[PDB]
Structures are given as C-alpha cells and as structure tokens.
Design a protein around this ligand. Structure first.
Ligand SMILES: NC(=O)C1=CN([C@@H]2O[C@H](COP(=O)(O)OP(=O)(O)OC[C@H]3O[C@@H](n4cnc5c(N)ncnc54)[C@H](O)[C@@H]3O)[C@@H](O)[C@H]2O)C=CC1
Ligand SMILES: Cc1cc2nc3c(=O)[nH]c(=O)nc-3n(C[C@H](O)[C@H](O)[C@H](O)COP(=O)(O)O)c2cc1C
Ligand code: SF4
Ligand code: SF4
Ligand code: SF4
Ligand code: FES
Ligand code: FES
Ligand SMILES: [K+]
Lengths: 213, 430, 263, 44
C-alpha cells in the first residue's frame, strides 16, 4: 500500500529479471504499434508484459522496461505506481479481485467477500500461506448486470452465490481451471427469465440499406 | 411521434448483443456487417459526416456531444501530422457494462465503425484503448481484427477502396480516469493517466500531438449502420435532439439485471418493468434510481414514474442521461451507504492531478463515511453541499463533477434521512 | 500588427495571439494568484488557484493555461473568481500541516500570503489530515513532504531546466506523492533552485535550516564570483552575519537561478 | 438451422496469458509503416 520503494533482498535493482526471447519478439511487435519517436507509448504494455512473465514487478522489470524503451526510470515508476494492476509486491497464483462498488454491493457482494474470507482463511489484502490466492477488493470491473462478480487473473466469474465461488475456489485448488462466465442460468447479459429482445432472427446483409449506396 | 420504446428487432443496431450468434467474420457478415463498406468509403468524408449529422447521433460516452459536429472538427487539410481516431473502450463507470458487450459480441461492428469513422475524419489509424480488465474482450477484438486484416477489410487498401487504415488495440492498466479522453490519450502515450487541460481539444493536439478524435465504442459501432440505413432512419427514433437507439444496463435491485438495446426516449418505468422484470418487490418497493451510471445524481421514485430516458428529460429531472446505466435501489437500501461507497470509488479513482478533486473528493468521502454512521451534525450537510460546489466546475476534467453530483443528488432528495440518521446517532451515543 | 483586443475588468489591452489570461492580466499590473504556474517552467494547470471568471461564460478558466480570445472581459475581482480562489485555498489548506512556526518558509510563504490575500480566514475541515513520508534527496534540500501541495514545480524544473528526470509523482489521488520512488539523491549543479520555486516549505535549504527568518533579513544585492557567469544574487544577512544567498532575476545572465556552489 | 439458444462465444475459455500479445505479434505483419516525428525521442 506504499508508493515508495525500499530495497529488500527479494526486491532490489540486482533482482534477476530479463525477458525471454519470445517476449522480446512480443515487445518488438508492441513498439511497432506506435509512431517513430514515441517509443515511450510502449511503457504500459511492455511493463504489463513484464507482469505476465514474472507475476509481479520487482524493481528490475521497471528498470529493464526503462532500459529497452530508452525512457527514464522515474517515468516507468510513475506508471507502475499509478495503475492498480501492476503488482509491485508478489501476489499469489490466483489473484482474486472482488468488486464491491454500488451495483455489486446492492446485489450482495459482501456475502461473497465473506465466503472467500472464510473459505481461504485470509482477509482482504492478505495471501494464503501456500501462495495460491491473493484476495483484494477492487472497484467496478464493468460487469454490473452480472453482479455479484469476481475476477481471477484474466477471467470474470459472474452472477455468483457463496456456493458458486466456493466451487470455483475448490476447482482452483484442485489444479483445474473454471469456466469464466455467469454461474446462474444465463449465458452473458440477457434477462434471466428469457429474452425480452433479439428473439427474431437477424435480417442479414442489405436490409434497410438506403438508395444511392 | 409522442410515445417511445417498444423497439422492434429489425431496428436493432446491435444484433448479437447476447452472444447467441457467431461474433466472428462469417457471423458478422451474415448479420449485415461489412456490407457495401467500399461504397461508403468512396463517397468521401463529407457524405459520412453529413449522415452522422443528419442522424442526430450524440456522444454515447455519456456527455452527449453531437457526434457529426465533433467528427467534423477533423475535416480539415493535413499539416504534416497524421490523424487518429481513438476508440474509448475503457468503460469504468459503475453500472455500465455495454461496451464490453459490443467488444465481446459484435467486434467487427466496432472495427467497421473504426474504418468508417476514420475515413470520415481522415484518420490514419484507430487506437482502441480497451480496459485492461477486459482481457478476454481484448483478445476477442484482436481475433476479429486479424479476421478483418486477412479479409482485406482493413489495412493496406481497406475494403478495396484505396484508403489505408490500421486498427490498434491498446490495453489499459486499471484506472477509471483513463476513460476521460485526454487522460486516455496520456495513457496511450505511456504516461500516467492524467487529463490534459482543454484547450487544446484533441482535434488540434491529441494523441502523440496529432489531430485526434476520441469516441465511445457505441457511437463508433453504430456509424456503419447509420451510413447504410441512413441518417433519417436513425433520427426517426427518440425525441428531437435525442435521436436513435441506446444500450441500457439495468442493474442493482431488479429481478433480471440485463443489457438491452431500446429506443431513445423510452420511459424509465417501462424500461425497468419490460426488460428487467421490474423492481424487486414491485414498483412500490422502488426507493431511488441512478439513471445513467455513478456520475449522474439519483432520482427518487416520484421522479422515476414519468421520466424519459434521453438526455433532455433527465436534464429536466436535474440528473443526467450519462452512460444510460440504470442502477435500481429498492426500499431496503441504505442509500447513504451506497452513495458513500460511490464517493469511495471516486476517491480511489481520482488521478490526483488538480487540487479540488485530489483534496475535496477525499474530504467528501470522509464526510460521507461519517454520514453513514450519523457521526455528524446537520450543519455539515450544507457544508458538504458547498464542498461539492467547490469541486464542480473548478477541476481539470469532469471526474470532480462526477463526484460532486452524487453528493448533490443524495442531499437534494434525501436530506431528511441524513438528518434522522444523525439525530439517532446523537440520541444513542450521548 | 496582429494584436487582439481583450479586457481585464473592462480595461482594454492589446495582446499577442497565444497570450494566456494570466499574462493579459499581468499587462495591466494585476497578478493572478498561482501555485503551479511559473513563467520559466512549462504550464501545468493543476493547482487551480488561477481560476478566473470570463464574463458571459458560466465556467471559470485556468488563467495560467487558457489563451485569451478576442473580446473576453476577464473579471479578476468578481464574486465567483473570489469564491473559486477561496474554495481552492480551502482544499490546499485541508491537508496542509500546522507547521508555520517550525517551517522555514514562514514569512516568505506563498501559501501563507495568498491564503491571507485570497482565501478564507477559518477552517471547515473537521477531519484528520494526511501525513507523508519524508524523502532523502541529498544534503542540500531538506524534504518535508507533508507540506507539499503537489504543484509539480519540482518535476518540471528537474525535467526541463536541470534535465534530470528523477523527480515525479508516485501513487494516485490524495495519496499521490512527489518524490523519486527510490532512495535517490537529486544532486544536480542546479538542484538548489527547487528550494526557490517550491511555493511551500516542502523543499527547504538544509544548510539555512532553522537559522533565520525572512522579515529580519537585510537584503544586499550583489554578484556571484564562484564562476565567470556573474550571477546576480541577494546576500541576505541578519545582524551582521551572512544568512543565505538567493538569486536575483537578471534576464540576460542567470535568469532567476543560481548554481549550488553559488547558493 | 436457426439457433438462438446456445452461447456461441466459447473461444475465450481457451485464452492463455499471452493470447493478446501473440495476436499483436501476428498482426504486426499486416500493418502500414508508422509515421515518424523525425527524431528518435523528444529527448533527442
Ligand atoms: N462512458 C463512461 O464509462 C463514462 C462516461 N462519463 C460521462 O462523461 C461525461 C463527461 O465527459 P467529458 O468528455 O469530460 O465532458 P464533455 O463536456 O466535455 O465533452 C464530451 C466530448 O465533446 C468534446 N467537446 C466538448 N465541448 C467541445 C468544444 N467546445 N470544442 C470541441 N470539442 C468539444 C470533448 O472533446 C469530448 O470528446 C459525463 O456526462 C459522464 O456521464 C463519465 C464517466 C464514465
Ligand atoms: C472521469 C471520466 C471517465 C470517463 N470514462 C469514459 C469511458 O470509460 N468510456 C467512454 O466512452 N467515455 C468516458 N468518458 C467520457 C469521455 O471523456 C468522452 O466524452 C468520450 O469517451 C468520447 O466522447 P463521445 O461520447 O462522443 O464518444 C469519461 C469521462 C470522464 C470525465
Ligand atoms: S479532477 Fe480528479 S480526476 Fe481530473 S485531472 Fe483532477 S485529480 Fe484528475
Ligand atoms: S509551507 Fe507555508 S503554510 Fe505550510 S507550514 Fe510552511 S509557512 Fe505554513
Ligand atoms: S515539493 Fe514543492 S515544488 Fe515540489 S510539487 Fe510539492 S509543493 Fe510543488
Ligand atoms: S459494479 Fe461491480 S462490476 Fe460494475
Ligand atoms: S496556476 Fe493556473 S492552475 Fe496552478
Ligand atoms: K521552498
């Protein structure tokens, strides 16, 4: 929760970090998306790439991103502390993010936060001792009609009950991967008691196209 | 036309909103996407801007600026710099989950919108700044962009029209402020997502210092349907200056929380009772509705009975249309706790750049955290009102406005509930 | 000429295109209050102290950044300009520490002075304040970052004039902190001028610390001899003893800076 | 046959941690040559 860095033996500028060569090819593809003379625009993806290789960002991933993009290291530190996805501390293998803003709080996200807490034996911000789960509490994840929902590392788990999130944590501990979707009967975002719209077949190419075109 | 709503399925722009059809290129072309795109591109920028101006399309991001007038700010000869369309796909607003559905289920509609809009504004390329939390949606959009490049629909000689146009996807990294257009531009440029002061507007100095139009996913993705069906078709829905269709996200205390496409000036009661299954406990169980996502002020049940869900009728209801994200709150809701959680959101999502938001949004969150418990006195209500008025209009971007407005709506419609909260705190703690 | 006509409080003034509202008011001898604007740094526009009413416009504009349009009547002393200044000063003083007796900036503090001139006379802030961890940027600049008002004159100086790029803002929101993010020592040849341009006592002189106080200092205008630049300085003395050395503005020599050897 | 009862977007169940960046690497060959500001960086 701090925004200064102190050198620890597991987080220092001599902590070993380097990209894999396939990650260097991915970095070249990232840098080619931006105009010549604006290589600094590749700070946010490549640093995120450094989080996808390592799981988190020690201050050698920040220094390596600053070195390969020829930007000052402070301008990478600003990005790494500004944005809430960059893990500047090592998180667990499954980073559970429970949304507790008002559309999820109205549909009882506190019960699911408590269910994760009493299932994993930890609280908000802590990590399980086997380094598998980090539970934090995030803002609106943009799945508001699928409230209450969580995010696990890339995946949204939606329309949750305490039983559903206990089942998801059970099959995360069992090595399997759960299905990223609503755990209720519906599929993505439709009304749960049947389609109130888009029941007709779509019309296809050419329908309603005006004259002179 | 006087009554609005009951939109037919043949008039839906966002068919395959629900993922029930193939989102890929065969399914998109079988639903009407990428049809006669070359004939749209060869009619020039002025024809496309005329169709968007005739359609009455306003900014679906939430402010409702006229889209054709906005996009015509780029209709000017080049000065050596390239021009850029930038598609705002951040969608950080609580309540709002519609652009996720457009990216996830109609991605080629967004890509064709990028092509048509960038042809209208003379843009070289499109940068779709997608939210970093929408990882599966971003990879979904990248598969559709690969299908559009491999079909020759974008890239070198896009749709066989002789117009070169790239479509890039930049992922965010977890900042709600990076959906504000200049903060989004700063986030694309590899910096902290801090908003720029306006002027310069992005059509003068935007991304990389180039001419730039930042436009929402929804106002971009409806533009090929506007160019095909006609602007007079799109202006036939909703009231005047309130034209078209709109995606609505009814969440909170309804029976069936859902995203649905609906005609523009639909009643809020008709929308909730028709597509969302009504309020939990009936319509008489309704306490309040945040009409357009978290930045719009709440309206109580007496306003929600007759109000129309477009821009002008919600401005007359002293709230905003916003992102058209209907957050429904029933009688069992601690409404001070919900608005204070919303102000807690706005202090966790505040980039810290200018003084009134950086200091006053945290100070409003502290006052609201005391108002939940009642640990306050009634003279601090009007004080808080003035604090909101010292943030509104005094900041760099409208996140300060969007944090002051829920406080103002809560005070304006629920001052007696705040007062009875504080006096019961005072009588059971003194 | 291509001068446009603008108005400051009804008074006409002819300005070059691209003149800001603040500079147009400066041409009639009115100094708009500011904290983040500095005429030798790039425009930031984030302290919001320079907010001023343009008439027939229902929104105050940031005068340091906003270019004037032809025919604007800038209302520097109107009611909503003064309310904007009082509100912004209230937010600046909400979390600011009660350190004026122990702070070296007292008496020569921009925050004190234009709190007296443009802010209210009392507080409505009934909460606890933030407290910021102090940084260590070297033996010259004492750092007390609770006093920081986040005007980013630090960062713009170190980036643009000193050419260093080691200062920045980490974090977000009210927890946004100006610093280096690491234990890093800001030792330029020009590193002492961030003591000058810090409007508050967040960056002070560590050798000058606690010794004197600006009202009792006699100001002797003199010349640097530490090099052949001839930087114009103020030697501030007190009771026959040299207390410190500040720059003088000479536009053709040292514009308003001095080297750390000089300082 | 017209189907409106199944969810056709089942591809993102199989996306890994490098799916977006491998798609960007695949798309790198389809793109136009970038414009240049004429200098290597604004600090050049
Ligand atoms: N969609 C979402 O996820 C969210 C949407 N919002 C909405 O954002 C809105 C505020 O957004 P802003 O862009 O900050 O405010 P808005 O006043 O400025 O501007 C909207 C658009 O119009 C353009 N524009 C406005 N006046 C102009 C002028 N004179 N010249 C040229 N261009 C001009 C701006 O460049 C911008 O692209 C609110 O209404 C809120 O509901 C807020 C938060 C989240
Ligand atoms: C704090 C803040 C966050 C915003 N977030 C978004 C967003 O996530 N998506 C979006 O489309 N617009 C967002 N906006 C509105 C944009 O600034 C801008 O008006 C819009 O993205 C593009 O204009 P348009 O509505 O014509 O498409 C936000 C505005 C503010 C002040
Ligand atoms: S009002 Fe808040 S969100 Fe906007 S520039 Fe200022 S600190 Fe940032
Ligand atoms: S910086 Fe100024 S206002 Fe703050 S404690 Fe020092 S003298 Fe007082
Ligand atoms: S330390 Fe001083 S100069 Fe630096 S940002 Fe803070 S108030 Fe401004
Ligand atoms: S409120 Fe939880 S996802 Fe939007
Ligand atoms: S002086 Fe213009 S905002 Fe700081
Ligand atoms: K100082």
């Amino acid at each position: 929760a701090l925004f200064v860095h102190r050198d620890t033996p597991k987080n220092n500028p001599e902590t070993p970090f380097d990209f894999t060569p396939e990650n260097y090819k991915r970095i070249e593809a990232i840098v080619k998306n931006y105009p010549e003379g604006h290589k600094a625009a590749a700070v946010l993806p490549v640093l995120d790439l450094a989080q996808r290789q390592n799981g988190w960002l020690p201050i050698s991933a920040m220094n390596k991103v600053a070195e390969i993009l020829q930007v000052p290291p402070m301008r990478v530190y600003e990005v790494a502390t500004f944005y809430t996805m960059y893990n500047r501390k090592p998180v667990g293998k499954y980073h559970i993010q429970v949304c507790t803003t008002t559309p999820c709080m109205l549909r009882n996200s506190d019960s699911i936060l408590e269910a994760i807490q009493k299932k994993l034996g930890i609280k908000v911000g802590e990590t399980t001792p086997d380094k598998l789960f980090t539970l934090i509490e995030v803002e609106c994840l943009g799945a508001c009609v699928n409230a209450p929902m969580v995010q696990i590392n890339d995946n949204y788990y939606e329309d949750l009950t305490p039983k559903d999130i206990e089942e998801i944590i059970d099959e995360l501990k069992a090595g399997k991967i759960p299905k990223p979707g609503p755990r209720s009967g519906r599929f993505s975002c439709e009304p749960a008691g049947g389609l109130t719209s888009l029941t007709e077949p779509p019309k296809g190419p050419g329908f309603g196209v005006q004259a002179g075109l | 036309k006087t009554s609005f709503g009951s939109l037919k399925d043949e008039d839906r722009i966002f068919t395959n909103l629900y993922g029930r059809h193939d989102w890929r290129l065969k399914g998109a072309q079988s639903r009407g996407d990428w049809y006669k795109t070359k004939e749209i591109l060869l009619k020039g920028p002025d024809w496309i801007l005329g169709e968007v101006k005739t359609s009455g399309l306003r900014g679906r991001g939430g402010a409702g600026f006229p889209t054709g007038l906005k996009w015509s700010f780029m209709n000017k000869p080049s000065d050596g710099r390239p021009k850029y369309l930038v598609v705002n796909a951040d969608e950080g607003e609580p309540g709002t989950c519609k652009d996720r559905e457009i990216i996830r289920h109609d991605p080629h509609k967004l890509v064709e919108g990028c092509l048509v809009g960038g042809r209208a504004m003379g843009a070289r390329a499109a940068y779709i700044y997608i939210r970093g939390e929408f990882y599966n949606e971003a990879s979904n959009l990248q598969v559709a962009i690969r299908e559009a490049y491999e079909a020759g629909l974008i890239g070198k000689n896009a749709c066989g029209s002789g117009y070169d146009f790239d479509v890039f996807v930049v992922r965010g990294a977890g900042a709600y402020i990076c959906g504000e257009e200049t903060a989004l531009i700063e986030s694309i440029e590899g910096k902290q997502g801090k908003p720029r002061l306006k002027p310069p507007f992005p059509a003068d100095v935007g991304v990389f210092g180039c001419p730039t139009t930042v436009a929402n996913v929804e106002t971009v993705a409806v533009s090929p349907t506007i160019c095909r069906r006609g602007g007079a078709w799109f202006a036939s829905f909703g009231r005047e200056r309130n034209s078209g269709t709109k995606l609505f996200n009814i969440s909170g205390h309804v029976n069936n929380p859902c995203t649905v496409e609906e005609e523009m000036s639909v009643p809020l009661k008709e929308l909730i009772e028709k597509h969302a299954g009504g309020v939990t406990g009936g319509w008489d169980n309704l306490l309040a509705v945040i009409p357009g996502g978290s930045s719009t002020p709440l309206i109580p049940k007496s306003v929600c009975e007759t109000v129309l869900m477009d821009f002008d009728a919600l401005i007359q209801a002293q709230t905003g249309l916003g992102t058209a994200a209907v957050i429904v709150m029933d009688r069992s809701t601690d409404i001070v706790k919900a608005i204070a959680r919303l102000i807690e959101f706005y202090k966790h999502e505040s980039c810290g750049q200018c003084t009134p938001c950086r200091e006053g949004v945290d100070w409003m969150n502290k006052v609201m955290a005391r108002f939940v418990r009642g640990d306050a006195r009634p003279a601090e209500i009007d004080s808080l009102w003035e604090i909101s008025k010292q943030i509104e209009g005094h900041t760099i971007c409208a996140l300060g406005d969007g944090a002051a407005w829920p406080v103002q709506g809560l005070i304006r419609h629920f001052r007696p509930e705040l007062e009875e909260r504080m006096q019961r705190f005072a009588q059971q703690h003194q | 000429s291509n001068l446009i006509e603008v108005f400051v409080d009804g008074q006409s003034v002819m300005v070059e295109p691209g003149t800001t509202v603040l500079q147009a008011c400066e041409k009639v001898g009115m100094q708009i209050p500011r904290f983040c604007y500095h005429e030798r740094l790039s425009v930031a526009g984030n302290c919001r102290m320079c907010l001023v009413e343009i008439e027939k416009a229902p929104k105050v504009v940031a005068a340091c950044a906003m270019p004037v349009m032809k025919g604007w009547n800038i209302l520097t002393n109107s009611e909503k300009t003064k309310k904007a200044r009082e509100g912004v000063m209230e937010f600046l003083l909400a979390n600011h520490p009660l350190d004026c007796p122990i702070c070296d900036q007292g008496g020569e503090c921009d925050l004190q002075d234009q709190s007296m001139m443009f802010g209210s006379d009392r507080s409505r802030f009934l909460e606890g304040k933030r407290a910021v961890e102090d940084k260590n940027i070297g033996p010259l600049v004492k750092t007390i970052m609770t006093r920081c008002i986040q005007c980013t004159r630090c960062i713009r100086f170190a980036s643009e004039i000193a050419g260093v790029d080691d200062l920045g803002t980490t974090g977000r929101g009210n927890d946004m902190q100006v610093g280096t993010y690491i234990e890093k020592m800001f030792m330029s040849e020009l590193s002492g001028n961030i003591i000058d341009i810090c409007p508050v006592g967040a960056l002070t002189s560590k050798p000058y610390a606690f010794t004197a106080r600006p009202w009792e200092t006699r100001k002797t205008e003199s010349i640097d001899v530490m090099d052949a630049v001839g930087s114009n300085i103020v030697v501030s003395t007190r009771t026959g003893e040299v207390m410190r050395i500040l720059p003088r503005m000479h536009e053709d020599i040292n514009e308003e800076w001095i080297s750390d050897k000089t300082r | 046959p017209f189907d409106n009862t199944t969810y056709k977007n089942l591809q993102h169940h199989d996306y890994s941690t490098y799916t977006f960046l491998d798609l960007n690497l695949d798309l790198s060959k389809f793109r136009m040559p970038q414009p240049s500001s004429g200098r290597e960086s604004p600090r050049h």
